[PDB]
Design a protein around this motif. Structure first.
Motif, mmCIF file in Angstrom:
data_model
loop_
_atom_site.group_PDB
_atom_site.id
_atom_site.type_symbol
_atom_site.label_atom_id
_atom_site.label_comp_id
_atom_site.label_asym_id
_atom_site.label_seq_id
_atom_site.Cartn_x
_atom_site.Cartn_y
_atom_site.Cartn_z
ATOM 1 N N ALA A 106 0.860 -1.065 -0.135
ATOM 2 C CA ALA A 106 0.028 0.113 -0.011
ATOM 3 C C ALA A 106 0.893 1.255 0.072
ATOM 4 O O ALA A 106 2.011 1.117 0.058
ATOM 5 N N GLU A 123 11.799 0.707 8.087
ATOM 6 C CA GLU A 123 12.283 0.327 6.792
ATOM 7 C C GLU A 123 11.926 1.579 5.843
ATOM 8 O O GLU A 123 10.940 2.121 5.848
ATOM 9 N N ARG A 124 12.695 1.733 4.661
ATOM 10 C CA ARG A 124 12.383 2.549 3.836
ATOM 11 C C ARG A 124 11.850 1.929 2.382
ATOM 12 O O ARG A 124 12.742 0.995 1.847
ATOM 13 N N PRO A 125 10.596 2.184 1.897
ATOM 14 C CA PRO A 125 10.250 1.579 0.585
ATOM 15 C C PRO A 125 10.699 2.267 -0.335
ATOM 16 O O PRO A 125 10.381 3.573 -0.537
ATOM 17 N N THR A 126 11.332 1.470 -1.392
ATOM 18 C CA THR A 126 11.879 2.274 -2.454
ATOM 19 C C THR A 126 10.663 2.380 -3.442
ATOM 20 O O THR A 126 9.773 1.864 -3.198
ATOM 21 N N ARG A 127 10.473 3.737 -3.885
ATOM 22 C CA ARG A 127 9.221 4.471 -4.475
ATOM 23 C C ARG A 127 8.825 3.205 -5.616
ATOM 24 O O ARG A 127 9.552 2.294 -6.208
ATOM 25 N N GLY A 128 7.375 3.362 -6.195
ATOM 26 C CA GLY A 128 7.021 2.541 -7.058
ATOM 27 C C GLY A 128 7.808 2.828 -8.444
ATOM 28 O O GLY A 128 8.643 3.493 -8.711
ATOM 29 N N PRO A 129 7.197 2.110 -9.346
ATOM 30 C CA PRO A 129 8.008 1.638 -10.689
ATOM 31 C C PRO A 129 8.269 3.302 -11.226
ATOM 32 O O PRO A 129 7.888 4.191 -11.012
ATOM 33 N N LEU A 131 -0.784 3.540 4.997
ATOM 34 C CA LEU A 131 -1.176 2.314 5.713
ATOM 35 C C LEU A 131 -1.521 2.920 7.240
ATOM 36 O O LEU A 131 -0.412 3.716 7.613
ATOM 37 N N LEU A 154 8.178 3.121 6.430
ATOM 38 C CA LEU A 154 7.511 1.917 7.047
ATOM 39 C C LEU A 154 7.916 1.882 8.593
ATOM 40 O O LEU A 154 8.845 1.925 8.698
ATOM 41 N N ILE A 194 1.309 0.074 13.209
ATOM 42 C CA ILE A 194 1.976 0.245 11.742
ATOM 43 C C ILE A 194 1.611 1.059 10.878
ATOM 44 O O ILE A 194 0.389 1.173 10.510
ATOM 45 N N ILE A 212 6.855 0.282 12.436
ATOM 46 C CA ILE A 212 6.200 -0.784 13.236
ATOM 47 C C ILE A 212 6.782 -0.401 14.555
ATOM 48 O O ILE A 212 7.931 -0.587 14.867
ATOM 49 N N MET A 238 2.782 3.794 7.529
ATOM 50 C CA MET A 238 3.672 4.087 6.261
ATOM 51 C C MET A 238 3.136 5.368 5.551
ATOM 52 O O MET A 238 1.944 5.540 5.265
ATOM 53 N N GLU A 275 19.900 9.428 8.301
ATOM 54 C CA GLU A 275 20.371 9.454 7.084
ATOM 55 C C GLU A 275 18.927 9.674 5.969
ATOM 56 O O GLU A 275 19.193 9.540 4.878
#
Lengths: 206, 206
Positions: free
Chosen positions: B1, B192-198, B4, B172, B116, B174, B118, B164
């Protein structure tokens, strides 16, 4: 809620995801994830087990990723457990799989396995003891947030408490998803009994 | 998602819930819950802190319970964090509260605090150190699953890693919900760092 079905995972892709479509056009993407849980406690005396779960992504989500995921990528999954039964076919009459509603690849810079369910017991508890004398119980749970039938297992103190439950009782489960034929089941880390909703008028009272 | 926002709690009612309606007819039920978290680790050396959170239930859910809950009842909450700001009024310009989507009173026979999220950082990290020399970071996060602004804090290893990050980065989170003016904030147990979408076509490439 009455029926609750939530799964959260963070694992690493063990192979490059392979796209696929249905005859009608539905995108289907299966991701094989691996990670490990440290079942240990206190000052050591224990260690930690691995898990390998195939998660299925369908539709537009499958369409936007089924091309960019490399073997070794760390992925976050938000999803639910899916129960399917049939004749013939498979391994076997039935299977429980993780269905991803969403996924988010994470940066590895340079594991998470949590499940929460609430349903009703489909049969009476089965309490057993190990040679060492450790209490262990197997529970059958029916969850409808079709209905999904899931297997749950608890140990020691929790097992003995769960042995006092009855078929049909409501149960709140919090644990982790585990493997093993071959079967995907839940290892309960926490259990609670939700008292049923408000009490009607009643013929003879209760 | 992308956005979140999930909160799960299990605590005991500290007072008998008191019903209430809006001029238009909306049922509003506030439950004051208490519990405790064991921030300790290893072979002791630490202990455990208490939490008191007011959770709000609205509508038919409020209507079916706002009459049956007794002070001392153990309750399970499934909900989310709500951010509200105004002029004048309150304590203060703003507040973050837990909004219950559902609740389930549990049998006590004879605590759980998990969050949790995001979203995106609203500003650059603020890393600081305690007299003892312990790393601590405060992060501002914007979550839109209106937008909700939440405060997050992390320590030691996590704090230094989070230092950083950049304003606008996806994150993300938790952890657990904590108190303290007076402010409800999140204590991150994991980040955690979600890498951006496509990645689009790109004018000059990336």
């Amino acid at each position: 809620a009455r029926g609750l079905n939530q799964v959260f995972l963070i694992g690493t892709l063990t192979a490059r995801p392979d796209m696929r479509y249905t005859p009608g056009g539905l995108a289907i993407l299966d991701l094989n994830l691996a990670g490990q849980d440290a079942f240990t406690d206190e000052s050591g005396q224990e260690r930690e087990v691995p898990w390998y779960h195939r998660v299925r992504l369908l539709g537009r989500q499958a369409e936007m990723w089924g091309d960019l995921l490399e073997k070794g990528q760390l992925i976050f999954v938000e999803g639910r457990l899916e129960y399917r039964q049939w004749e013939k076919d498979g391994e076997k009459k039935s299977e429980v799989q993780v269905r991803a509603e969403f996924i988010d690849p994470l940066e590895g810079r340079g594991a998470l396995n949590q499940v929460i369910l609430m349903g009703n017991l489909t049969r009476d508890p089965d309490l057993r003891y190990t040679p060492q004398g450790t209490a262990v119980v197997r529970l059958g749970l029916a969850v409808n947030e079709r209905t999904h039938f899931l297997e749950v297992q608890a140990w020691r103190e929790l097992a003995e408490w769960a042995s006092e439950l009855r078929k049909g009782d409501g149960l709140l489960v919090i644990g982790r998803l585990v493997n093993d034929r071959f079967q995907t089941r839940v290892e309960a880390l926490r259990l609670e009994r939700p008292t049923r909703g408000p009490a009607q008028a009643g013929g003879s009272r209760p």
